[PDB]
Design a protein around this ligand. Structure first.
Ligand code: NA
Ligand code: NA
Ligand code: NA
Length: 302
């Protein structure tokens, strides 16, 4: 009789649309009883939410049937680009609902993605109706935001110049690029938009003048900052493409694969071996700029 749309927006968060995620959707109406309380409903939703995906799949595969018109078939959803909203990570399913009494429900569980990412989605039990606070009315479209976590870090350093008389200063106008090594070849961090919380890398004959290659310029505080750009675990290099006049190099970036070690202690990004202070979210603060560490010293005296 009546139908509703469930829309998954699968995105990547750091503790962003992710294509190729897969979900199975089961008719869960049999988990419901007539004249259930809202409290009983919330208790049943929490029970399924607190199961692992594997646990919920053992229960659903054995006992329930796929249901709903998904893009991969009955009960089958794959995340893709949505031209209608120009956003990635989108999958829509049409399901049979009862907007007047809680008698229809769907259990949605992520399965293996299409052939550095924590897939943290939970089993999601959608019990209709879902009442719109704003309007009173039952919702006709449910938007779900299953959680995926990408691990990224935020390298920066300060460029200082040292005079032969031992005076020193922050250097403005040094131009850097970032490269990594793959099969004995340099790939440079490009200007392409991030997809799946992952960067694009280009081979170039001339990184300084190649518009594809992202450049990072030292500012009036000496700061060379990735800024909005981030990197995942591994080893990278800031390469000086144009030195500051009078102070005319690869600076190694070592990114650990986790914020904390087995004992809870911070694992630092190392800049040419120096531990780099960092906050969650990666913003270089005014206090960090005052500190001006880690510092790379460029010598005037040839
Ligand atoms: Na959970
Ligand atoms: Na950054
Ligand atoms: Na330093």
């Amino acid at each position: 009789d009546q139908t509703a749309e469930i829309v998954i927006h699968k995105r990547i968060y750091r503790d962003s649309g992710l294509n190729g995620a897969n979900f199975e959707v089961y008719d869960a109406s049999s988990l419901l009883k007539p004249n259930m309380t809202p409290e009983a409903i919330r208790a049943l939703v929490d029970r399924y939410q607190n199961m692992t995906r594997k646990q919920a799949l053992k229960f659903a595969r054995a006992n329930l049937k796929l249901a709903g018109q998904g893009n991969k078939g009955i009960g089958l959803m794959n995340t893709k680009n949505d031209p209608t909203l120009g956003e990635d990570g989108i999958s829509r399913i049409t399901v049979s609902v009862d907007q007047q009494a809680p008698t229809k429900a769907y259990l949605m569980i992520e399965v293996a993605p299409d052939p550095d990412l924590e897939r943290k989605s939970s089993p999601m039990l959608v019990v209709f109706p879902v009442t719109d606070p704003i309007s009173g009315n039952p919702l006709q479209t449910i938007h779900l935001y299953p959680k995926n976590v990408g691990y990224v870090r935020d390298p920066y350093f300060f460029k200082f110049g040292v005079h032969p008389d031992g005076t020193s200063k922050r250097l403005a106008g040094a131009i850097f690029a970032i490269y990594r090594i793959e099969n004995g070849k340099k790939l440079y961090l490009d200007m392409s938009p991030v997809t799946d919380l992952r960067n694009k890398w280009v081979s170039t004959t001339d990184p300084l003048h190649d518009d594809r290659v992202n450049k990072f310029v030292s500012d009036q505080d000496g700061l060379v900052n990735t800024g909005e750009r981030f990197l995942p675990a591994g080893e990278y290099f800031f390469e000086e493409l144009q030195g500051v006049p009078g102070y005319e190099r690869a600076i190694k970036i070592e990114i650990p694969d986790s914020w904390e070690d087995e004992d809870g202690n911070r694992r630092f990004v190392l800049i040419d071996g120096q531990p780099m202070q960092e906050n969650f979210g990666g913003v270089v603060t005014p206090e960090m700029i005052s500190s001006g560490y880690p510092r790379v010293y460029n010598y005037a005296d040839k």
